[PDB]
Amino acid sequence: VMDVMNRLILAMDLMNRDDALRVTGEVREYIDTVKIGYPLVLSEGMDIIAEFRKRFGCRIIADFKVADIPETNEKICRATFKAGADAIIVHGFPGADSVRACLNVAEEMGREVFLLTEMSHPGAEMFIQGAADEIARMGVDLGVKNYVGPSTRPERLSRLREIIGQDSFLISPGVGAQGGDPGETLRFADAIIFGRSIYLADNPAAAAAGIIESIKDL
Amino acid sequence: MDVMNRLILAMDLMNRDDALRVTGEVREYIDTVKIGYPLVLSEGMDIIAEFRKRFGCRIIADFKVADIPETNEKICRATFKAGADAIIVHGFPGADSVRACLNVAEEMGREVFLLTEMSHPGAEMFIQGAADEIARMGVDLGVKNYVGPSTRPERLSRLREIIGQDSFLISPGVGAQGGDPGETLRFADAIIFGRSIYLADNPAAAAAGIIESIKDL
Ligand SMILES: O=C1CC(=O)N([C@@H]2O[C@H](COP(=O)(O)O)[C@@H](O)[C@H]2O)C(=O)N1
Numbered sequence: 001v002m003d004v005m006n007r008l009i010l011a012m013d014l015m016n017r018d019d020a021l022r023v024t025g026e027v028r029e030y031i032d033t034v035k036i037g038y039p040l041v042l043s044e045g046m047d048i049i050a051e052f053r054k055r056f057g058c059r060i061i062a063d064f065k066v067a068d069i070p071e072t073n074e075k076i077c078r079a080t081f082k083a084g085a086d087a088i089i090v091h092g093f094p095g096a097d098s099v100r101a102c103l104n105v106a107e108e109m110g111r112e113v114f115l116l117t118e119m120s121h122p123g124a125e126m127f128i129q130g131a132a133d134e135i136a137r138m139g140v141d142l143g144v145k146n147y148v149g150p151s152t153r154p155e156r157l158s159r160l161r162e163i164i165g166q167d168s169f170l171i172s173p174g175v176g177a178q179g180g181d182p183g184e185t186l187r188f189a190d191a192i193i194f195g196r197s198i199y200l201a202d203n204p205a206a207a208a209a210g211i212i213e214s215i216k217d218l
Numbered sequence: 219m220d221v222m223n224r225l226i227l228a229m230d231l232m233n234r235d236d237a238l239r240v241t242g243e244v245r246e247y248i249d250t251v252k253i254g255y256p257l258v259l260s261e262g263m264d265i266i267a268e269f270r271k272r273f274g275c276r277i278i279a280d281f282k283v284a285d286i287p288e289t290n291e292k293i294c295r296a297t298f299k300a301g302a303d304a305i306i307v308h309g310f311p312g313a314d315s316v317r318a319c320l321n322v323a324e325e326m327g328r329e330v331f332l333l334t335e336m337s338h339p340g341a342e343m344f345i346q347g348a349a350d351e352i353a354r355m356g357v358d359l360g361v362k363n364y365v366g367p368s369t370r371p372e373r374l375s376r377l378r379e380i381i382g383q384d385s386f387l388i389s390p391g392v393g394a395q396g397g398d399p400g401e402t403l404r405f406a407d408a409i410i411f412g413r414s415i416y417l418a419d420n421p422a423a424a425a426a427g428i429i430e431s432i433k434d435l
């Protein structure tokens with residue numbers, strides 16, 4: 001599994017290249033894995049991936065929540081990996097064929113798929129939560145090895161870990177700003193994702209070091 | 219939204235030159251283009267402004283928005299900044315995520331389209347069973363624009379029943395995926411075509427043919 005420094009992933013959702021670069025640079029000693037999503041990509045272009053690779057020693061996870069038909073999913077994955085992303089995050093709710101399309105491209109191109117099972121926000125309870133266990137089981141059956149699950153619902157995160165087993169890799173957002181607890185989340189997740197708690201801090205480095213101190217025994 | 223010939227081009231070519239040429243080749247038949255991630259991630263968000271400059275077409279950003287509210291807001295803002303007239307949002311992540319998009323759309327003078335059931339076989343696993351409830355959520359939220367599947371006319375009909383005749387409904391899955399143009403226009407206001415047009419030896423002839431087949435509609 002990818003070796004994530006300090007079990008910590010930065011969600012770089014600043015939409016300004018100068019700010020995104022500054023903040024990422026400031027926490028570089030603490031984090032070697034960066035999640036880049038559409039807020040930054042749609043503001044600055046896919047070449048932002050190339051710039052992050054050039055400037056930092058960081059793994060890139062493209063958080064594109066891929067959620068289209070198989071044919072379109074294939075194209076999205078090809079463009080994303082072509083740009084230098086190490087991995088891509090894909091939604092499970094559109095079904096097995098849509099996931100398989102992403103897995104197939106990742107296999108061909110030598111990269112990885114993360115499967116988003118349940119989400120961390122209140123709205124996730126309406127439809128996703130009820131499908132989440134089955135989405136995860138589908139992931140296992142498809143041979144998915146990397147997963148995303150919600151820090152805001154520890155009981156649900158625990159269940160997801162059970163389904164996918166101890167060998168699978170699990171990362172979890174919703175820590176800090178959304179109210180999830182780093183320590184409790186790391187009971188089940190391999191790595192935790194932080195956005196606003198770090199990138200909106202007056203001193204992002206101090207924020208990162210503080211989080212690290214809080215989980216040092218883990 | 220007045221869509222010329224009830225026809226929307228899904229421009230999912232991933233090369234700027236090809237995308238521009240092919241769109242130019244069918245410009246006389248359309249005035250509404252759906253641009254998605256295949257083109258955007260290959261050529262950048264500036265392509266949207268370029269389409270407006272070349273064609274004056276309206277642009278629907280098909281981004282299947284499916285994040286938490288905070289991120290959805292950012293995605294819509296960046297998308298509308300690029301000149302998109304509308305954005306497509308998934309309903310499956312729930313009401314708060316859709317509302318985030320509605321907010322930005324209102325602020326910038328744009329429209330949200332709610333995707334309720336999808337056209338591909340995998341849609342049967344999870345989406346289909348939630349689709350009616352997603353449509354009603356749209357109604358509750360005041361959504362006026364919807365997307366539903368050409369590949370399942372009975373499902374598309376049900377979606378039309380839920381949203382009412384006043385709502386605007388567009389439908390992909392026509393041609394390549396098996397949907398029929400005429401049958402689909404029984405329920406949808408406009409039909410979406412990607413491959414049947416943009417992979418056609420002669421895209422203009424492909425569009426002309428489609429129009430011929432629905433001319434009475
Ligand atoms: O269940 C989900 C999945 C997701 O990727 N994320 C995202 O993970 C990040 C959370 O950031 P923050 O720490 O709440 O600022 C953002 O990039 C989100 O889009 C989420 O918050 N919940």
Ligand SMILES: O=C1CC(=O)N([C@@H]2O[C@H](COP(=O)(O)O)[C@@H](O)[C@H]2O)C(=O)N1
Nearest residue numbers: 069072228336337390391394411412413
């Ligand atoms: O349920 C869905 C929604 C969607 O937007 N679309 C898309 O609409 C287009 C269909 O293109 P095509 O006509 O099958 O080549 C693509 O851009 C797809 O991503 C889909 O085919 N089914």
